[PDB]
Symmetry: C2
Subunit: 131 residues, 2 copies
Amino acid sequence: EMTKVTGKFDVKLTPENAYATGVGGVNLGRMALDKTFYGELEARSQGEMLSAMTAVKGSAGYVAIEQVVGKLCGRQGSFVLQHFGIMTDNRLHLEVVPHSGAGELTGLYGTMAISIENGQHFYEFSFCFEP
Amino acid sequence: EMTKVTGKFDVKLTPENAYATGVGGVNLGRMALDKTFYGELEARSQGEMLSAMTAVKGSAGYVAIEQVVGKLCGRQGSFVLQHFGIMTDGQNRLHLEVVPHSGAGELTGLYGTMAISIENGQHFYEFSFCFEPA
């Protein structure tokens, strides 16, 4: 039922000042996100990420929301991706926010995955359209 | 068995400037969060939330990270809570967990998930927690 595509993306993450302060070995972060997707998703995104690093190695959490604008498989539109990640020594959920799809991407539903191979970021996007 | 404690909390949301701009009917937000928990979790927290409201009533998403400081069943410490909420048709499906190894002080090793309810206009937390072996 899901269409499945992969491609490359670039990401730039600019530090920002976090409202709250970490205690007990926690360090909190806020970052601005700018990304460019190439291939079947040919798009630009902007958003923000929040982060919490703990005093234990490899243990951290991230969340983000990003607005994507471009083309998916030729259809011009926009949608929002919402991220939840927990690294303990990794669990990542990246989901299209329901009814965030607009333009020719109205009705979009789906989830994305990512990886990094030799410094190159890649995405997989599993998606479909609500009838 | 997990211990499950229930109690009141209040939250203040202060609007901040979101980096991105929503399009296609989406409105994106960033807010500062200041909360107070009462009862078995007696604590204060600060953090931020990011939200996306869509053009369709009852459909939205939000995420947040907050640092909690206070007492849980009498023991003083801190931990971080991490939220991921997706609402469709007005029904929020919320995942809210303690970030592993964020527990400090006497709450070192804290593990847990929290649910959020409302009764007569008052928010309540239901917090199921335990501790990992020292």
